Each structure stands twice: as C-alpha cells, then as structure tokens.
Design a protein around this ligand. Sequence first.
Ligand SMILES: Nc1ncnc2c1ncn2[C@@H]1O[C@H](COP(=O)(O)OP(=O)(O)O)[C@@H](O)[C@H]1O
Ligand code: VO4
Ligand SMILES: [Mg+2]
Length: 759
Amino acid sequence: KPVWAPHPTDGFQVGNIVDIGPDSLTIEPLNQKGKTFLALINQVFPAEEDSKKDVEDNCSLMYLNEATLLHNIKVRYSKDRIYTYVANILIAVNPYFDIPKIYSSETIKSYQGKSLGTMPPHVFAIADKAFRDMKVLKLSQSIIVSGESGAGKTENTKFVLRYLTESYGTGDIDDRIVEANPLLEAFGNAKTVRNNNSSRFGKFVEIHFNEKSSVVGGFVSHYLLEKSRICVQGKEERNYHIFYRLCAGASEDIRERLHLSSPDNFRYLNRGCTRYFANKETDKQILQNRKSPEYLKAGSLKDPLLDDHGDFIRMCTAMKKIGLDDEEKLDLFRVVAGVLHLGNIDFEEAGSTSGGCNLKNKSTQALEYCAELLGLDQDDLRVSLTTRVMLVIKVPLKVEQANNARDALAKTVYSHLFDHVVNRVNQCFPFETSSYFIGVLDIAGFEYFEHNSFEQFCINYCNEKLQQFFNERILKEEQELYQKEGLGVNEVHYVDNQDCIDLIEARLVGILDILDEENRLPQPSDQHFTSAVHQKHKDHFRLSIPRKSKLAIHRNIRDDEGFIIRHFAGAVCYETTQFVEKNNDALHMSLESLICESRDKFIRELFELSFISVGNKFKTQLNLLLDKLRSTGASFIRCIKPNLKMTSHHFEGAQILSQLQCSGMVSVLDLMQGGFPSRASFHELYNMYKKYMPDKLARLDPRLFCKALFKALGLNEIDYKFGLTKVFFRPGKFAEFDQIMKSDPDHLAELVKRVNHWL
Ligand SMILES: Nc1ncnc2c1ncn2[C@@H]1O[C@H](COP(=O)(O)OP(=O)(O)O)[C@@H](O)[C@H]1O
Ligand code: VO4
Ligand SMILES: [Mg+2]
C-alpha cells in the first residue's frame, strides 16, 4: 500500500516501501519501477487510499498526519476550494484569482444560520458561527485571521465584515462598515515585494450589537503605521496607494491646484517603483502627463485586484458613501500633495558661510507649493528645516540634518493624517452603548526581505504575540480543559514561542528596553545597542549573530551590525542601523510648533531630550488588544500563501507544509483527532429544559436527563463523552451539538416532547 515520503520541493511524494533496513526505508516512487531512494522511518507516512478524494474536515481523514493534511489541502486547492477545516478552525489557501460566485449575495444567504459541517468550509461559516455564539453565549467574539504577508488576511477580513453586515445588519450602517476598508487601504496599504496590496498597519474591526443582536455601530482600532515608507522605498515597492491613485485619477483642475505631476517628479515616490497598476483599458483612461518614463517604457503593473485609476474612483465613491463632503475630500488630498512637495525641498552644503546648508535653488517652487498647501510661511519653513535652536543659540544644520528634519515633519504630518482618517471612519458609525461586539483582527503579516530593518522587526514581533495567543487558546487551554474534566485525552506537545516574546519584551533586558535605554544615552549608538543585545542574551535559543545566517548576503554583516531572531515562522536577519532613530516617535518642538501654528484650520486640527519609545508604545497597545481578545470567544482563520510568485494554480508543497508546521496546525490536527471541540455543562443544559420537563424527567439528575435527551435524539455514544461537569462532542458533530443548545422555546418543548415519547 502506497505511502508518503519526503520530497525537497513537493514536501512529500507518493511511493511504495520495497525493502526495509536498520534505521531506514527504501521507497519506490509511483510509476518509477527503476528508481528507489532512502527515507528515515519517522519521515514516511500512511496515505489515503483514494488519492483524488478530499474531505471537508481534515479530522475525517483515515490517517491524520502532516503528509495527509498537505495532500488533502492540495486536492481541494486544485479544485478551486481554498477553504478546509480542522474541526472548527478554518484553513484558507490564497487562490490569487477571483473564483466566481463563492462570495455572492446568494452564497451569503445559503450560509445563514447553518451549523459548521452542513455547508462546505467557508469564511462565511466562521463568521456565522461567531454571531451565533455571541447570541447564545452572550459573549463578545473575535475572529483572528493569521498568516504571512500575502497569505490573504485582508481579503478574508473583508469577506467576514461583508457577511456579517449583509446578514445581520440593519438593512445604511451596513455598507459603511464595508466601505471603510478600501478607504483605509488607500492610506495604509502599499506595494511591497510580497504583496501588491500589503497592509502596513494592523487593524481590529469591531461590529457592535445591542441586546437583541442588532448592529448599532462599529469601531476600528489601528496599530503602528509604517513611517519610513512615507519617505523612501526600495525600487520594486511603492509608497501608500493614495499617492498614485491621486496622480493617476485626479481631474486636471485638482492636479493644477495641488501641483501634481507624474510620480517620477517627487522624491518621496521616485526611489520606488513609479508605475501604476492598470490593465490595457484603464491605462487609456490615465492622462499622458501622469505617466512616468519608467511607465512609458516598461508598461503598467498587472494585478487581478488593484487598479490605481479605478481605485481612485472607488475611493471617492466610498468617501461619499460614508459621508465626507467634497471639502473634507479636498482637504485630505491637499495634505497628501503637501507631503509630496515637502519631500522635494532639497539642501546643499554651506559650510564656509553659515556652517550649515541652504535650500538648493531648484527647490524654490517646492518650498512655495509645500508652504501654500500646508498653510505655512515659506520663510518659517525654510528656517525650521535648516536651523534649530540648541543648548541657547540657533545653530545651522548640516545637509544630513536638514533631510532628517524634512522627513520627520513629513512622517508626522502623514501619520496624523492617517490617524485623522481612521477617526473620521469611526465617526461615520458611532454608538453610545452596546451589549457585545464581533471583532475581526487583521495584522501586518510575517515578512522578511534581503534587508530587514525596524519595520520588519515590529511587524514580526506582532505576529509572534498572535501566534502565542493561538497557542494559549487552542493548544494550551484546550488540553488544560480536557485534563481538568478528566477526559484522558493523549497529551500533545509542541514548540512554544513565549521565549521569543520574552527576548523582545522582558523588562530591562528585553530588546525593546535595551533599545529605549540606548535612546537615552548621551551618545546613542546602533552599534552599542546591538552589542548589548548579544551580550545580555548569550546562548539564548532565539538569538544569533548575522554571520550564522543561511543566506550569503548576510555573511559580511558584523556582530554589532545586526542579529537573527528565530521567530516561530522562521529566522530573520535584522540589520540594526537606524533602529535608534526609528525607535523615537517624538517630533522636535520647532517642527511641532511650526505645523500646529499653520494658517489652515484642518492642519491645526490634525495636531489637536524629547523621546517617545515606538517599541514600547506598540507593546502597550498590543497587550491591551490581547486583554480584549482574552475576554472574548475566539475563532481562527489560518491563511496560507501558496507560492512566492503571486500566481494561481501553483501549490508549492514544501512552502505550504512549512506554514502548516509553523502555524501549529499539524499539532492542532493531532490534538483534535481525539479531542472535543464542543461542550457545555450538564447543569446549564438541565436548567434550560427544566421548565418544560414533566415531573418524570425533572427528577433525573442533570447528567441523566442529558443521557436521555441524547439517546432520544438518535445520538450515538461514540460521538460524545461525559466529563466531570461538562458533556463534550467530537469533531463532526457541530450540527447535533447546536440542536441541543437551541434555546428557542418551541425547540426546547419539541425535544422534551421527543424525550417523553422515547420513554
Ligand atoms: N480569496 C481570495 N480571492 C481572490 N484573491 C485573493 C483572495 N485572497 C487573497 N487574494 C489576492 O492576494 C492578494 C493578497 O491578499 P491580502 O489579503 O492582501 O494578503 P495579506 O493581507 O494576508 O498580506 C490580494 O490583493 C488578492 O489579489
Ligand atoms: O502583505 V500583508 O497585508 O500580511 O502586510
Ligand atoms: Mg492585509
């Protein structure tokens, strides 16, 4: 009988064991009567007998191992079924094209009120299950969407919000919650090499409900907008979409008023890719004077979803749908164009004269446009960017320092604009009180590149905490409940990642605190910071020096120029240059005073050793989020990126297997095969049917009424198990378990009626 054996790029391959030896197996790959190869015994797995079949729940497999899990998800993917369960946890493999109709209004309605198992695996079923648990358990809910960059977290987050608003919404508040997202994507999403539409901030979106489970409003929390991208990008990346939507789609009147032109004309865009997303037809809708030479030569960027011209139109519709007037819209655009012009203010050395620098003569217009759009005096701005009062005098800044002042001001203005946008979105659906919420979490996903800096460190830190919460809720607490209730479920061990979080966040000697301490030294040094990190974490399993990397490009990074963190999702080598200055969130007073005293009302509203730790601010925000998550029932969607090329129909087995392992899903499948995802207490069950019980039943102890109710309901006893205080149901029995929990008086009387008859 055929088995699964290792394969370097497919993960596993199918063959037959043809001989066995001391500590190995000899495998003959299917249809290769010649060749054999050797495999360790613990690396060969039994395979499903039918290789073309799939099951909707991986718990239903004959053999439950990492190789069968991989293959089952693959067979489904090959048939455009991107969703599969492991009990009540959803696995979602990015298709990288739009599969027709699977998100239609019709499909939405078909999922309404259905139990897990009675419809195909779908994100819609996860959302419905959260709404039902909310209602029945009287308990706010959270849906955690996880995965690496480009796995599909954001698309799925939008499917959940759409499902919930369409299904349980009022029937104009809905739409508003949905249209908020494309609006925030404009300001906080950008092309990176992993994702054409990468989220460069984390979000938690809360749909709030009253006592009768009707939507009363929403609330969007936002976490750590990436700042450095505002000013510079790698050549295959872009700044936030809004810059290119505006350049591509603005009317000529708007382009004139804001002095826009093709993206190559702005420093804050032109180190990056200056090409638009467009297809053959949308290209023709963009005026020639918006196109860069790079665009004219190389043509447009292709994407199934993004279209800068078409996305500008949609973003303006979305603004009008949530209630921004044309004045608010133009204000947003003006500040955006002001940031652009700000970045064109360039500096040349003037050491022999002032000892500092002057503006380059060519930057004259930029200074003018910037000052006009930001309502500042040209001279005030000139002076704030080229000089600074210090300790007493007023000293001329060097060229490098003026650049930093220019960029720090640009980062803060744009950051405050983004903050204003998110707040404006919460204003479009406020509420004074609510009973529960369903929150959906969508973070920036695990990412690494040839060069990794502070941005990737913060982002991967946030993925680390999330994975830990999954471990806590699913692998730890679940096993603690089985034990506490005496179920004798075989313990499953796993590698935990709390040590990685400690390395980062522990008091005084965590990376975040060591970095903070560096910012407060007289001579802050990235090198000094990094040495201290290595020194205080000797032999720590999650830390290494860069030269131990598996990649050659890292071989020449000195010990004090970076470190490797061994994240749950994999080793990442960070280069520490700029960590110190990137960790400071504080804007110097001169620049703050400059922008707070703008002539423009709107800009004033943006703003209502100086050092504010970005790292510890972020930590504090995430711990509060986690406290909120712990106070809820949690559902999990694990997104999987099938390949490194953004193509459809290219399942990379080894890449996918690696993510199934790192996400803990192989461990979960192991625990679940003999676990009990559904349960409720004997007493609460009894107490709920009590008032409908004739005396013959009421007299039974709670436990024995349950046995009667289950036996009357045709329920087989392989399918459940009585613990100390709770009864537990196995995977595949969600429908049967939901019928038992149904609290509808007609339903309760009907089941009691069935028990009476059964006696
Ligand atoms: N279910 C899906 N259907 C169609 N396209 C998808 C789906 N999920 C992801 N994609 C594509 O993959 C890209 C990346 O998805 P996204 O949700 O932005 O990833 P993440 O947020 O996890 O980094 C999307 O912009 C879209 O093109
Ligand atoms: O590419 V992502 O939206 O995980 O940041
Ligand atoms: Mg996203």
